[PDB]
């Protein structure tokens, strides 16, 4: 029989948001935003007992729209969660349910995941007035607890990489799933297989160093939840694109787990990577939550302050505007949400030492009420920020809502995923004949797309494959999508995959087939790694990774998506090809350009920095340039480039001659003046001894589906 | 030789301005320009600043930011820019590469404008005015930008960072670097009216004696003298008219200004901080010294005119004017917003300023046509890690339409309380206000800032500021005498709510002298006895007089000079202000973090705050609405809801305030207890039977008289 004031306490501070171990005053400082709540309760738990509060403190102080308290004696490791009281009126958007225990949206560590159970929903499930009703079952025992943490971490060798690192212009990106990376890597002891620690191991670090990639883009590592409808199918959220907190790294990747060790385990991994001269880019979901729409659960944001955080139907305020396609969309217009997102970004930069972000469904971040605005508050604040102005920003230039196709529209400093590039290039080798323009442009960093906005070929992130869609193997191994293992009666995944089976579906024995696939794989690989702009490799395509024609394996936490490291002749002999191709790209400036090629002679030279030929031997004209084709052929003049380094030197390369033939049949091209040693191709066969040079404007036959690069050694 | 037959590097876009890069032995020049077709970097020598020593074309670009890196250059270098572009004034395009321009990210400017028709980009004479294109080279008339070496050892300095003076206990001292120490024949000149002078041991000591916690400087942003002042023998004294947001005013610098003004400023701030004094700078972000059209072309107009300035949306050849100074910065542009925020962060982390008071803060919220207090600028500013910790005070309005924005300001934001200023002026002037009016002013004006969730200390109380009369003139003039400004006395507010006590100006009638000194102390007590943050107007303790000029914005002379020569009347008031500031800061009951509620607390009989009438009977209802010339209230120090950062409830003494603004005498009945006289505005010796009142007894109170009382027993 005591009071909330017979327990030693201090008023605390509104800032920072979240919970802060304040060594000096031997206690913790709890800050929580909510401008609509009427009352707030701090819930302290213990290691062993997590069904009930050890203790219940009432946050009684509130500076503006921020309740704050300081509890003495709390140190790092202490589990806590939030109750929020307030008005319940689903008609008006108010969805306060103080029975529902909530997660601190500023937690830097989160204990478990959700034990799915009707009681986490704050409306009555089986009730006819779903989500209009008020369920008052306590849900404490199911929702994971927030963990206070000790942010101290010694970034040994840290600080020096900080510093003339990988510019976007020589970068080569490697998209990886932390788990899938290394789950099936018995090369390491289990229990770091498919974790952070596993990712940044000697074995692996050496692999990446070998492979030749410079930066790694990890899939979502924001603590995320497994959708119930995936759970009720014996399934999981493998990709992670359903975040519930924006500051905590997913616990299911931590080797140390789960209690504070996820963030400790992460930092070491980045430390380890930087020591090896490797950047880190994290996939970032900011556009939606795991709380989905109405009918969805009440875990974190919905409880604390639903009016903010979430874009609501302005006429209803009971339902959720959804441009993300996942039930809700984050209200990037509310000052507090803009702050949270930005904090998160700075937090992950200065604290976790991330080097850049790939924003998922970017356009969703530039939404006001129904309209896109590449000049919204959030983006401008992000642009002026001293810390963030220095990190790499990359974008999925589109959301799913109406008018959400934002290719070419993102403020400077942004590189955007080029989906023009992927679609086109994929349809080119497929067999389709596109206008000589639509492909030459692609090949040259899509100047049309980006040059209209003062951007460079950097901004163009070129890729053939990706976690979204097929793999590179399954891109030449399928015509239709086989996502029946997802348990959605194969009613999910892109229908147009602009793919081709090489004359089958699925695995095969017909050598004539395999040969085709192995060719194409190398046509794709030659392209990407010879097109202007920034190339991205899909993690595993150097292993010929297969998802059995699953082009949407988002819930497939298993062998379907596991990296397979068991390499036979074929699989491995390609690995060697990707390695040598990458090295080629890297060793040659005429492909890592900060400026576009114009079509003229520069610096008073007698040659063009570039030149597009026809099939015999002939510069392209206004008409041939607009008319379709399946055979592109172009010369880059290393020496007559307008590329200057940071020291003001211009930058010769060698002169190349790229011959791309997507034509199914063979063709005969006439080589332009001068003499032209062979370097690289698609040919899996012994290179004919009469193909290894070309002289005197003479000519040569080329099997369909074949890429060739040539180096002029005399003119 | 072409622009390419001298060594260069492409340089870097971030950050903006010129930046000494030791390791690469050279300077990096960066400059925002959306619409420029061409940019040219001018390098002058110390000796010759008529023509450019060299011209370098900024060829390299990155989005909307031009930059080059020039090898060899060191800090100290003079430079300006030439921005080439289209000239279509009716469209808002006002580029004129004949006009040499100041770098808007200049951390140091060397000198000021040599006023001359050549600096206007349009033909001054011509009959179609601003639509015309003047082709005179303005170089020899325009101050050059300087590359500064930013280094500086802030001894100790980094430990006040740390805790500092919390708004709860603050006491604000508005000073004008110049006037403060101009007429200070203590120090050497070549140091009178300068940054260094302000920070001399003699002045620090003074400031500690007086007992103020933080100084608030008038604009120190490099500014120019408006030409319509130059052509009157006049200058811009206050300096509310800058062209650069990064470099401190040259004219306040003891060590010249080729970087001197920067160096000299830091060491002033450094010294203040070693005496535990906070530095707040009055800042102007809302408008530029480039006026409207017909104005000069110096910096922004010339670098990008469609970017920096709010243009009439139907014309874009005329400037939207919400400030009254010709033009208005549009903080809706991503780069404009970045510059203001960059600037703010620069003065914080670089000049170690402790906060800003924004002049015409409302005009900063204009975005489109109206005041959206939810604008991009304010939002970015709120979420900023650095600016998150500093103080943000505001002139909560502008001269615009619907600009009056009192109380609407974001949080952490404090406000100049204009209503206090006025209400209190009128109270002691005679007028009888609703007992509710004055009452609210005294409880920190909850009826205003309480609605927005703000605290009592977010209200910045003042009876005087640089706008209008001083305190000495406030009780000394009924009308204004701005004749000296040469504007037929059409400038300056007309309603000053002042009361000359019985003359106009300086007198001999002692009856009138004395009325003055009574009023001065009446105002003084009320201020330092109200809830909220009190701001003293520099020189008021010195009984400073502008000779009844209530707008000495251009009077850079004896009128505004701090007169340090004090007689007895002076020293007596000085002493009194001291004793009174010392009282404010002694008693937590006035430095409150929360508002008095009208009720008891903590299960105590007495209620934390009570108001009374002439007689004991507590202020009933219709008495709370009906006007009054007499205020009386009792703070119960021992029953306040006040908690320090340690979770301790605070307590104070219990005080009984008597504010008789009525001109005649009055009898008052003390409530029950046994009371002691602590301070009053009486200039005569206090009768011994006023020193201790007891037992519902009564007391004669002369008109215009304020009294504070402590209840020794109950
Ligand atoms: C970018 O962001 C997208 C949305 O967050 C990612 O979406 C992928 O993962 C989602 C969980 C999945 N959701 C839908 C699945 C289905 C049926 O297939 C429905 O039952 C659900 O209710 C939907 O929410 C997306 O379909 C899937 O593409 C994307 O991978 C990121 O790159
Ligand atoms: C807040 O901001 C105000 C404007 O920046 C400051 O204004 C004071 O100084 C101005 C230069 C002065 N300008 C006008 C003067 C006159 C006639 O008196 C006209 O001829 C000019 O064209 C106007 O620009 C203001 O009148 C004066 O109050 C104010 O002090 C700051 O606190
Ligand atoms: O609406 C979602 C779609 O938007 C755009 O068309 C993208 O190019 C496509 O990949 C994506 O699936
Ligand atoms: O709406 C989506 C479409 O927008 C534009 O038409 C693009 O050119 C096209 O590639 C894309 O699929
Ligand atoms: O428009 C500016 C004016 O607004 C209000 O009237 C203020 O009371 C006055 O002091 C200020 O000068
Ligand atoms: O002129 C001064 C007056 O201007 C406006 O009417 C304001 O609303 C008022 O508060 C202010 O006193």
TrEMBL record, chain A:
Q: Which SMART domains match?
A: Aamy (SM00642)
Superkingdom of this entry's organism?
Archaea
- GO BP annotations listed: glycogen catabolic process
Question: Its Gene Ontology molecular function terms?
Answer: aminopeptidase activity; amylo-alpha-1,6-glucosidase activity
Task: Give the Pfam families listed for this entry.
Answer: Alpha-amylase, CBM_48
Residue ranges constituting the Glycosyl hydrolase family 13 catalytic domain according to the UniProt record? 175-585
Against InterPro entries, the record matches this protein to: GH, GH13_cat_dom, GlgX_Isoamylase_N_E_set, Glyco_hydro_13_N, Glyco_hydro_b, Glycogen_debranch_GlgX, Ig-like_fold, Ig_E-set
UniProt keywords (A-Z) are: Aminopeptidase, Carbohydrate metabolism, Glycosidase, Hydrolase, Protease, Transit peptide
Please give the positions of the paired cysteines in each disulfide bond. Answer: 251-258, 502-516
Mind telling me which NCBIfam families this protein's record contains?
Answer: glgX_debranch
Family the UniProt entry places it in: Belongs to the glycosyl hydrolase 13 family.
The name under which this protein is listed is Glycogen debranching enzyme
From the UniProt record, report the name of the gene that encodes this protein.
Answer: orf c06021
């Amino acid at each position: 029989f005591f009071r909330t004031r017979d327990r030693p306490l201090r008023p605390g501070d509104p800032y920072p948001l979240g919970s802060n171990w304040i060594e000096d005053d031997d206690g913790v400082n709890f800050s929580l935003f909510s401008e609509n709540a009427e009352k707030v309760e701090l819930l302290l738990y213990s290691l062993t007992n997590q069904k009930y509060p050890k203790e219940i403190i009432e946050v009684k102080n509130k500076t503006g729209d921020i309740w704050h308290v300081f509890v003495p004696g709390l140190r790092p490791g202490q589990l806590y969660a939030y109750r929020v009281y307030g008005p319940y009126k689903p008609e008006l958007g108010l969805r306060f349910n103080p029975n529902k225990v909530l997660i601190d949206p500023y937690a830097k560590a989160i204990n478990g995941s959700v034990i799915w159970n009707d009681a986490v929903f704050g409306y009555k499930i089986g009730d006819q007035n779903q989500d209009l009703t008020y369920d008052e079952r306590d849900s404490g025992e199911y929702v994971p607890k927030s963990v206070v943490i000790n942010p101290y971490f010694e970034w040994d060798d840290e600080d020096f990489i900080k510093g003339k690192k990988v510019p976007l212009k020589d970068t080569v990106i490697y998209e990886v799933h932390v788990k899938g990376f290394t789950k099936l890597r018995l090369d390491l002891p289990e229990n770091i297989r498919g974790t952070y620690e596993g990712l940044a191991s000697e074995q692996m670090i050496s692999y990446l160093k070998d492979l030749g990639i410079t930066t790694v883009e990890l899939m979502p590592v924001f603590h995320f939840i497994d959708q119930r409808f995936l759970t009720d199918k014996g399934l999981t959220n493998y990709w992670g694109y359903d975040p519930i907190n924006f500051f905590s790294p997913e616990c299911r990747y931590s080797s140390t787990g789960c209690l504070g060790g996820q963030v400790l385990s992460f930092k070491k991994m980045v430390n380890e990577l930087h020591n090896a001269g490797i950047e880190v880019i994290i996939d970032v979901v900011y556009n939606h939550t795991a709380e989905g729409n109405h009918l969805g659960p009440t875990l974190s944001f919905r409880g604390i302050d639903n009016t903010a955080y979430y874009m609501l139907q302005p006429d209803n305020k009971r339902y959720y505007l959804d441009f993300t396609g996942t039930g809700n969309t984050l209200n990037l217009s509310h000052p507090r949400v803009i702050q949270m997102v930005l904090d998160s970004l700075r937090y992950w930069v200065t604290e976790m030492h991330v080097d850049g972000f790939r924003f998922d469904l970017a356009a969703a971040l530039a939404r006001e009420l129904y309209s896109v605005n590449m000049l919204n508050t959030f983006f401008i604040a992000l642009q002026q920020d001293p810390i963030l102005s220095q990190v790499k920003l990359i974008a999925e230039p589109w959301d799913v809502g109406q008018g959400g196709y934002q290719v070419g529209n993102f403020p400077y400093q942004w590189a955007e995923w080029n989906g023009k590039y992927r679609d086109s290039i994929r349809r080119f080798w497929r067999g389709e004949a596109l206008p000589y323009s639509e492909i030459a442009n692609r090949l040259l960093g899509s100047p049309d797309i980006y040059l209209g906005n003062n951007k460079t070929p950097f901004a163009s992130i070129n890729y053939v494959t990706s976690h979204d869609g097929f793999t590179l193997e399954d891109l030449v191994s399928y015509n239709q999508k086989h996502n029946e293992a997802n348990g959605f009666n194969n009613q999910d995944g892109m229908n147009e995959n602009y793919s081709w089976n090489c004359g089958a579906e699925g695995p095969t024995n017909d050598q004539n087939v395999v040969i085709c696939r192995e060719k194409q794989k190398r046509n794709f690989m030659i392209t990407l790694l010879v097109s202007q702009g920034t190339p991205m490799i899909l993690g595993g395509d150097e292993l010929s990774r297969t998802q059995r024609g699953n082009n949407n394996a988002f819930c497939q936490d298993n062998e379907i998506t596991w990296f397979d490291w068991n390499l036979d002749e074929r699989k491995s002999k390609f690995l060697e090809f990707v390695k040598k191709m990458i090295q080629f790209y890297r060793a040659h400036p005429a492909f890592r350009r900060e400026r576009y090629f114009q079509g003229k002679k520069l610096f008073g030279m007698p040659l063009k920095d570039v030149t597009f030929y026809t099939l015999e031997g002939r510069e392209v004209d206004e008409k041939t340039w607009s008319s379709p084709t399946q055979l592109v052929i172009f010369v880059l003049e290393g020496s007559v480039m307008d590329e200057i380094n940071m020291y003001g030197e211009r930058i010769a390369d060698d002169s190349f001659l790229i011959i791309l033939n997507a034509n199914p049949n063979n063709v005969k091209v006439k080589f332009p003046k001068g003499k032209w040693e062979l370097v690289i191709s698609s040919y899996l066969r012994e290179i004919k001894p009469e193909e290894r040079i070309i002289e005197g404007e003479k000519e040569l036959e080329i099997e369909g589906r074949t890429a060739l690069v040539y180096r002029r050694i005399e003119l």
